[PDB]
Write a protein that binds this DNA or RNA. Structure first.
Ligand SMILES: [Mg+2]
Ligand SMILES: [Zn+2]
Ligand SMILES: [Zn+2]
Lengths: 1266, 108, 87
DNA sequence: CGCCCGCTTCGGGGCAACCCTGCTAATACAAATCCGGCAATGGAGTCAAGACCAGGTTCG
DNA sequence: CGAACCTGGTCTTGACTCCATTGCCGGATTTGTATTAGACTGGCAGGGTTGCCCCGAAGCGGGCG
């Protein structure tokens, strides 16, 4: 318990506040609805800025001005009444309002479900009639006094009732007498008979009025007596006239009130524990909806019971006041004041409170009093949450007022806006330009920008040098820029790393740390090899620069986020510093082999010798600088500094063909010799044509064998050589080089006559519109592939357009085909194909109509790209929401469970073909089991990193199934262990004990959503993680046996005959849109199916395969399903990321039978907590609850969180926060989300206690030596 | 384009000298419903008996030095609004009228 | 916030106090004590001529003479170039 | 061969969120508060001389 | 080496001089309260929109006497 908050935080307990605590918090009672004088502009006494209450605005100056010194501190001047202090206590100090009438807090009344409604067990739609003064309610009654007086009371009730009988006796008698008088005055004279009968009828209807008036009075009396006999608490007297005519009789036997004080009384004469035991008995003995409602009530009742709370605080008596600096009235230039929109609500509350108080002190009739009380209640409701009930209170021009709860909820809510971001000091941004001469661990930087960034540093250093007397003339010199300041700026920028970021940050390499260096210009020079990581083209995209300050921050930037240390993917291990667009073409030209070239080797010898060899590559360089040798010509050098390949090396020298001394010949080109000069000394000769895939394999080889700093230098040298030979490559684009295929026109004639026949057959009407459209689509796709085929065979290889593509720098062949040839089918704006199609190339130039058709697909693609990047950001949000609490905490859990990998299946001959998806699956893993070769040796021992050579040895040994570890089977309670995680994909070594693998997995999954070019795309992925029911919902089997297959009327009627004696599982609602699954051949009636065999084509729900075949099968299914989509977009993702995500899905289990230890059926609790409490409860209470494994969605998993602050910002923040306060659930601050929000050093990376508490001393020997 | 404002409060910058302060007194004030409040006054300061405390109600000084309790007047009564415009004999006539009225109502 | 902390002025005022104490300690003890008690630079309260002549046991006139002499001694640009730069 | 209730499903209603859309006139009077101008000052500073020699500097 | 002498200041003394600092009275203005007698006795933006959950009711089936 520490309100001054000095840095030893452990817990954060939210709790409901008593009115005693509220008046304990405050430093005074505000009681006047004033803010500030209009004239002197000083705050008023007893107002919402009262310096007597809230505090001084002038640092150590009281209000009356008697004391104005800091030596006068902690005293209160007797005139002004103000504690003289520092003027930022007005940020902290709160005020309160003692009310005249009680008020309910709105969060316990107008939520879902109604907390007051469950606590009282009353209807909310009747409770609103209570608290808004529409209905009286009996809050107490004396039952024994009625019980022993009630015979006398019903005797006087009979006396009361007999009086109405005497009344109607007298009235009917006098009216019968008066009608006899009407008869005597009708029969003594002569008149028309019907008027006399109408006088009779008048008399009879009058005595009818008498008798039913009497009957109605008796009904009222028997009703009010029945109400008095059936009188009890929690009874509501609606329409109040019964109450008003009631209370005067027997008011000494009951108390019935109206409004919030009645609620207060009902809470006061209330045991929780009697109704607690009552609800325990009801859930002990009940059934169905009654017991379900009893459970739903017992939730909040046991919540109040278990904690040290009290439901007395649910009603409110004293309302606190937020400190005024949080709601300030700042002036602008000219006295235009800027309030904070809470002050209006507070003024409404203060005014209505004082009006009520004056009405009570005056003595007022009842309607005005209850009116003012209801207005006070609605005022406090508008204060807390405007628009929660009824109509939102607005201000000028019907804009609704920001309430107090509006600070926390919604878009501008306090949680989310804190979670969104903060603008920071020591930062900057500019547009970026390429820096192709720079080192990899560098960045160019505009000097006028760094002059502002590093300004306190350069001020300190030119105070150290005697260039200024102080810091003030130093700052003035920085403004005046005296040219020695540039030298001092160089000195202070020397060895001080900075951060760089391109918005948006897609993944971990969106932030990197470079060494700055002062460059002319005003743009940020970026190294070109990190453009792939930043996804930064130079079309004008800006980047943001930050700056670390502390020594820890400089260390983290220098070591972690440095350029040279982050080369590979965090996603799938392949490098991102790899050469690209230009330098790939450069090196491809540099290493390609061209026969028929100048100075080419020939072995043939006439009178001359063969005349092709060269003794040294230096001689080759000389003979190439003279115009004899072309570079790409094949020659036979003698090499003395390069390592020969394994064939030649093992052939010559056997033990080691060690290139520092050895000398050997080879037939290559000069270019490949210069190329292998870039590669390090230990690496063998390559002698291939450098495709981008070849270079990727080379850099993977280097990173897996050699240290990183070697690889960074190698890639830098490759960048330089690639640019230098991208210059000489001669790759230009002329329109004379966009050659057209000559027999294109006759192909167009061919398929035009075919399409003409098809459309003429449609004009016959023999086939419909759809079939002819599909035939046109297929014919023009055939023509498209025909033209592309002819184009592909027509181009020579030195055509630069096909050269760039075949090198693999950029662009597929279809863009070349649409450059020269035929565009083909352009889409419908719906998504179909336009059957015309475009028959021309861009070099031919389209028509008006063709270009107008192309516009549809172009604009649709742009809008789709915007929608995709927004929704991919949202999915990345959801993945970070789930996986934020999975870090490595232990080295090894030391289980022996674990998954198996398919791992290069054999042939029907038996030939082990390599499975294509091994690199995403089997690599970077640790074997939890051994591998033996037909009971031979152990080829790979338990727990080895499973990189390339040992997997190649397993392919040599001819085994395909290995039980390998996973995070699905890690036995640590709090996250994962390191050995089940395996190799970290970016380091190349084993993962550490502090890595936040969850966030790495989240970014690795969420990143290629922009490249996910489309239910087969991003919403498919999203509903797979949301675990929703599929639209392609197809049945899977339940047991083996042949099928009862049938396709009846207009949809499918398919059943399954079980192999065992069992029921046929009936599958009724299968539409004809589904189709029969092809598997093993096409499915047929009478096929013996598996247990997990899918009936139709499509995608079953994972809930069914969980319910049938458990967790292992559904994990194996989900990984394969999501990975298949990322295969379909050609994006390699390692599977352990999806493993981490699905592990978070399968944490919690349901309850179907309670056992005997505080369990509601259907509750979702963690599995490990469940198993631990079971192993405790088997002794002394041994009823193990029946738990079932359940698959919960990612949003559902997020909402089933640990802490309230851990959730706090997702969905119904109010509803989270209210029962968070009801449960009084304290936080433990174990995730990183909360520690970010409170700004604590998070328990990840550099933050865990193993690394935080490192003792540092020198070695004692060197300590003595120095 | 840039706009600024000013919270009307002085921001002075000295050092938080914890050791050297003006010495001060503490006076115990008591409210009505048994609540104690101790208010830090200066040494050179007269201690007022009456006080508006942190409780918000009026709090008096704990030593009974007897400040003057009210020395005020009631604002105006409904009796005063009546008596400033009517006669006591007229009110007597109305009173005897209503007395004879409840007479005639009650016993006949 | 035009009434916020400029944050360079704070450390400038700190350095002002620091080199101010240095320059006040360049002179003798009685003179520095006179200036500090006169302008309240050691406590915050300017003790007048009576209090200074009380704490040194001397007339008001002697305190006035000593203070005038300290004003004469401070008025050297050699002593006060760094002080001139402070305003 | 009927009975009776419990399960399931549809359906409507309510609630959270969010944007659109609209978007009579003095007087009487007292009480308080301010401010304006002499007038007690005594205090806080300020010229001016003068006395205390004490110690280096001058002449013998 | 001793008398003559100017200057280190050092501090006292009176004598004066300016000035805030209450204080008091008189006036100015400023704010708060009470009082106006012909009769004159119940309105209004919300509005919608999506979506999701929750309870009520309906419909039906199934296990029972
Ligand atoms: Mg761009
Ligand atoms: Zn004050
Ligand atoms: Zn493990």
């Amino acid at each position: 318990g520490a309100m001054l908050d000095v840095n030893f935080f452990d817990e954060l307990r939210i709790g409901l506040a008593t009115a005693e605590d509220i008046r304990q918090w405050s430093y005074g009672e505000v009681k006047k609805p004033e803010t500030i004088n209009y004239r002197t502009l000083k705050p008023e006494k007893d107002g919402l800025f009262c310096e007597k209450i809230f505090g001084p605005t002038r640092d150590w100056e009281c209000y009356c001005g008697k004391y104005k010194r800091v030596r006068f501190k902690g005293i209160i001047c007797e005139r002004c009444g103000v504690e003289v202090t520092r003027a930022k206590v007005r940020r902290e100090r709160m005020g309160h309002i003692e009310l005249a009438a009680p008020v309910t807090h709105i969060w316990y009344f107008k939520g879902v479900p109604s907390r007051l409604g469950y606590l009282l067990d009353l209807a909310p739609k009747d409770l609103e009639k209570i608290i808004y003064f529409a209905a009286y309610v009996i809050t107490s009654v004396d039952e024994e006094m009625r019980h022993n007086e009630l015979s006398t009371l019903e005797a006087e009730m009979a006396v009361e009732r007999k009086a109405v009988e005497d009344q109607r006796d007298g009235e009917l008698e006098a009216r019968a007498q008066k009608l006899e008088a009407d008869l005597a005055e009708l029969e003594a004279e002569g008149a028309k008979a019907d008027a006399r009968r109408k006088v009779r009828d008048g008399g009879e209807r009058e005595m009818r009025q008498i008798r039913d008036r009497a009957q109605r009075e008796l009904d009222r009396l028997e009703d009010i007596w029945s109400t008095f006999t059936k009188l009890a608490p929690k009874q509501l007297i609606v329409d109040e006239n019964l109450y008003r005519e009631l209370v005067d009789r027997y008011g000494e036997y009951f108390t019935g009130a109206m409004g919030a004080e009645s609620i207060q009384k009902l809470i006061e004469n209330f045991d929780i524990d009697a109704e607690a035991e009552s609800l325990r008995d009801v859930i002990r003995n009940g059934k169905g909806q009654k017991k379900l409602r009893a459970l739903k009530r017992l939730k909040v009742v046991a919540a109040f019971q278990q904690s040290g709370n009290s439901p007395m605080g649910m009603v409110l008596d004293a309302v606190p006041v937020i400190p005024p600096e949080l709601r300030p009235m700042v002036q602008l230039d000219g006295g235009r004041f800027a309030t904070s929109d809470l002050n209006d609500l507070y003024r409404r509350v203060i005014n209505r409170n004082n009006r009520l108080k004056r009405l009570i002190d005056l003595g007022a009739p009842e309607i005005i009093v209850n009116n003012e009380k209801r207005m006070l209640q609605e005022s406090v409701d508008a204060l807390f949450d405007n628009g929660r009930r009824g109509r939102p209170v607005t201000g000028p021009g019907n804009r609704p007022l920001k309430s107090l709860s509006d600070l926390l909820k919604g878009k501008q809510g306090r949680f989310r806006q804190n979670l969104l971001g903060k603008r920071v000091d020591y930062s900057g941004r500019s547009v970026i330009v390429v820096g192709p001469q720079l080192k990899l661990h560098q960045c160019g930087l505009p000097k006028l920008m760094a002059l502002e960034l590093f300004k306190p540093f350069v001020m300190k250093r030119l105070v150290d040098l005697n260039h200024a007397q102080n810091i003030k003339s130093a700052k003035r010199m920085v403004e005046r820029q005296r040219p020695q300041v540039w030298d001092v700026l160089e000195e202070v920028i020397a060895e001080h790393p900075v951060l760089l970021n391109r918005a948006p940050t897609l993944h971990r390499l969106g932030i990197q740390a470079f060494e700055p260096m002062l460059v002319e210009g005003k743009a940020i020079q970026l190294h070109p090899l990190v453009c792939e990581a930043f996804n930064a083209d130079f079309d004008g995209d800006q980047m943001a620069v930050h700056l670390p300050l502390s020594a820890e921050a400089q260390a983290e930037a220098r070591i972690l986020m440095l350029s040279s240390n982050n080369i590979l993917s965090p996603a799938s291990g392949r490098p991102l510093a790899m050469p690209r667009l230009d330098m790939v073409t450069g090196l491809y030209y540099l290493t390609t082999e061209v026969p028929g070239d100048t100075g080419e080797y020939q072995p043939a010898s006439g009178d001359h010798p063969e005349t092709g060899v060269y003794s040294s590559p230096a001689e080759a360089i000389m003979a190439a600088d003279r115009g004899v040798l072309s570079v790409r010509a094949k020659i036979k050098v003698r090499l003395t500094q390069l390592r020969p390949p394994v064939e030649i090396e093992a052939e010559l020298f056997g033990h080691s063909g060690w290139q520092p001394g050895d000398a050997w010949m080879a037939e290559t080109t000069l270019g490949r010799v210069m190329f292998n000069e870039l590669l390090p000394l230990g690496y063998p000769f390559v002698n291939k044509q450098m495709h981008k895939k070849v270079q990727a394999a080379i850099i993977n080889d280097l990173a897996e064998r050699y240290p990183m700093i070697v690889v960074a230098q190698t890639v830098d040298k490759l960048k330089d050589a690639g640019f230098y030979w991208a210059t000489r490559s001669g790759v230009t684009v002329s329109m004379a080089d966009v050659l057209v295929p000559p027999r294109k026109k006759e192909i167009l004639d061919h398929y035009e006559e075919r399409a003409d026949k098809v459309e003429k057959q449609f004009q016959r009407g023999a086939l419909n519109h759809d079939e002819r459209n599909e035939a046109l689509v297929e014919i023009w796709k055939e023509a498209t592939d025909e033209v592309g085929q002819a184009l592909r065979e027509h181009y020579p290889d030195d055509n630069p357009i096909i050269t760039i593509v075949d090198s693999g720098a950029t662009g597929n062949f279809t863009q070349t085909r649409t450059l020269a040839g035929m565009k083909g089918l352009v889409t419908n704006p719906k998504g179909e194909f336009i059957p015309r199609p475009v028959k021309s190339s861009f070099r031919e130039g389209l028509t008006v109509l063709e270009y107008f058709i192309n516009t549809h697909g172009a604009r649709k693609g742009l809008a789709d790209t915007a929608l995709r990047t927004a929704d991919s950001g949202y999915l990345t949000r959801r993945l970070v929401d789930v996986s934020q609490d999975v870090i490595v905490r232990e080295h090894d859990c030391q289980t022996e469970r674990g998954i198996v990998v398919e791992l290069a299946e054999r042939a029907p001959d038996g030939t082990l073909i390599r499975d294509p998806y091994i690199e995403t699956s089997a690599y970077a893993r640790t074997l939890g089991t051994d591998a033996v070769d037909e009971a031979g040796n152990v080829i790979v021992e338990r727990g080895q990193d499973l990189g390339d050579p040992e997997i190649d040895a397993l392919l040599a040994a001819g085994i395909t199934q290995v039980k390998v570890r996973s995070v699905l089977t890690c036995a640590t309670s709090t996250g994962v262990c390191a050995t089940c995680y395996g190799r970290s994909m970016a380091t190349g070594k084993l993962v550490d004990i502090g890595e936040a693998v969850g966030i790495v997995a989240a970014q690795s999954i969420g990143e290629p959503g922009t490249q996910l070019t489309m239910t087969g795309g991003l919403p498919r992925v999203q509903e797979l993680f949301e675990a929703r029911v599929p639209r392609g919902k197809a049945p899977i089997a339940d047991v083996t046996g042949r099928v009862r297959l049938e396709d009846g009327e207009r949809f499918y009627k398919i059943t399954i005959v079980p192999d065992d004696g069992g029921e046929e599982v009936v599958y009724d609602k299968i539409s004809k849109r589904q189709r029969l699954r092809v598997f093993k051949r096409v499915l047929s009636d009478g096929d013996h199916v598996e247990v997990g065999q899918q009936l139709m084509e499509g995608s079953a729900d994972p809930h069914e395969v969980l319910r049938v075949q458990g967790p292992r099968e559904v994990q194996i299914h989900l990984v394969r399903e999501v990975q298949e989509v990322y295969r379909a977009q050609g994006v390699s993702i390692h599977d352990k990321h999806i493993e981490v995500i699905v592990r978070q899905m399968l944490r919690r289990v349901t309850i179907i039978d309670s056992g005997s230890t505080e369990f509601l059926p259907g509750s979702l609790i963690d599995r490990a907590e469940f198993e631990a409490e079971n192993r405790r409860v088997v002794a002394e209470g041994g009823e193990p609850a029946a738990g079932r494994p359940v698959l919960m969605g990612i949003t559902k998993a997020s909402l089933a969180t640990d802490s309230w602050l851990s959730a706090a910002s997702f969905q119904e923040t109010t509803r989270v926060l209210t029962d968070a306060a009801i449960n009084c659930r304290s936080d433990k601050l174990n995730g990183l989300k909360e520690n970010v929000i409170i700004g604590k050093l998070i328990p990840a990376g550099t933050g865990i206690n193993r690394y935080r508490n490192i003792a540092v001393q020198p070695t004692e020997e060197a300590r003595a030596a120095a | 384009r840039v706009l600024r404002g000013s919270r009307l409060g002085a921001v002075s910058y000295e050092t938080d000298r914890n050791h050297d302060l003006a010495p001060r007194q503490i006076a115990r004030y008591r409210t009505d419903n048994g609540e104690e409040f101790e208010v830090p006054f200066a040494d050179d300061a007269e201690i007022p008996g009456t006080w508006l405390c942190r409780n918000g109600m009026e709090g008096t000084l704990i030593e009974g030095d007897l400040p003057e309790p009210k020395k005020v007047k009631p604002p105006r009564t409904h009796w005063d609004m009546l008596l400033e415009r009517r006669s006591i004999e007229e009110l007597e006539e109305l009173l005897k009228e209503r007395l004879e009225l409840i007479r005639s109502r009650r016993r006949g | 916030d035009s009434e916020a902390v400029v944050a360079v002025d704070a450390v400038s005022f700190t350095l002002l106090q620091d080199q101010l104490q240095s320059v006040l300690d360049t002179l003798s003890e009685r003179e520095a004590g006179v200036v500090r008690l006169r302008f309240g630079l050691t406590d915050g309260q300017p003790r007048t001529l009576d209090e200074i002549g009380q704490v040194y046991g001397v007339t008001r006139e002697r305190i006035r003479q000593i203070e005038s002499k300290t004003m004469s001694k401070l008025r050297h640009p050699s002593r006060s170039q760094v002080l001139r730069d402070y305003l």
